[PDB]
């Protein structure tokens, strides 16, 4: 899975090791091995969420097969909100998540695409 987190919290207000803990959490939530989780955190951005520039975070989750239905994503959402609100000390209203299903022919790995691995 691919997790991308944008936040307007400065880098020195983002807990150390967040990207690593997010890997373990994602493994537990999406059911994929932690060594297959990819995380990108981009802090110190200028953001408005729900029209407000108060501290917030946007998370994007992309994966093959496990984020393609409302029922699945409803569950994932619950857990990721729990993890983020705690780690970043943000209210539930200051976080939004977007889910993106991917297919194997879209992922380049070790010089080829996953379709052939």
From Swiss-Prot:
The modification N6-acetyllysine is found at residue 32. Keywords: Acetylation, Cytoplasm, Lyase, Melanin biosynthesis. It is an enzyme of class 4 (lyase). It is found in: Cytoplasm. One of its GO terms (biological process) is positive regulation of inflammatory response. It comes from the Eukaryota. Highly expressed in the liver and at lower levels in the heart, lung and pancreas. GO terms for cellular component: cytoplasm; extracellular exosome; extracellular space. GO terms for molecular function: cytokine receptor binding; D-dopachrome decarboxylase activity; dopachrome isomerase activity; phenylpyruvate tautomerase activity. InterPro entries: Macrophage_inhib_fac, Macrophage_inhib_fac_CS, Tautomerase/MIF_sf. It catalyses: D-dopachrome + H(+) = 5,6-dihydroxyindole + CO2. Its EC number is 4.1.1.84. Changing residue 1 to A: Loss of enzyme activity. Gene3D superfamilies: Macrophage Migration Inhibitory Factor (3.30.429.10). The modification N-acetylproline is found at residue 1. Homotrimer. Tautomerization of D-dopachrome with decarboxylation to give 5,6-dihydroxyindole (DHI). Belongs to the MIF family. This is D-dopachrome decarboxylase. It comes from Homo sapiens. The gene is DDT.
């Amino acid at each position: 899975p691919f997790l991308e987190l944008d936040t307007n919290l400065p880098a020195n207000r983002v807990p150390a090791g967040l990207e690593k803990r997010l890997c373990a959490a994602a493994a537990s939530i999406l059911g994929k091995p932690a060594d297959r989780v990819n995380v990108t955190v981009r802090p110190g951005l200028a953001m408005a969420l729900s029209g407000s520039t108060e501290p917030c975070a946007q998370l994007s989750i992309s994966s093959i097969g496990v984020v393609g239905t409302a029922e699945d994503n409803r569950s994932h959402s619950a857990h990721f909100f729990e993890f983020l609100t705690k780690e970043l000390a943000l209210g539930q209203d200051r976080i939004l998540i977007r889910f993106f299903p991917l297919e194997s022919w879209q992922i380049g790995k070790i010089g080829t695409v996953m379709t052939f691995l």
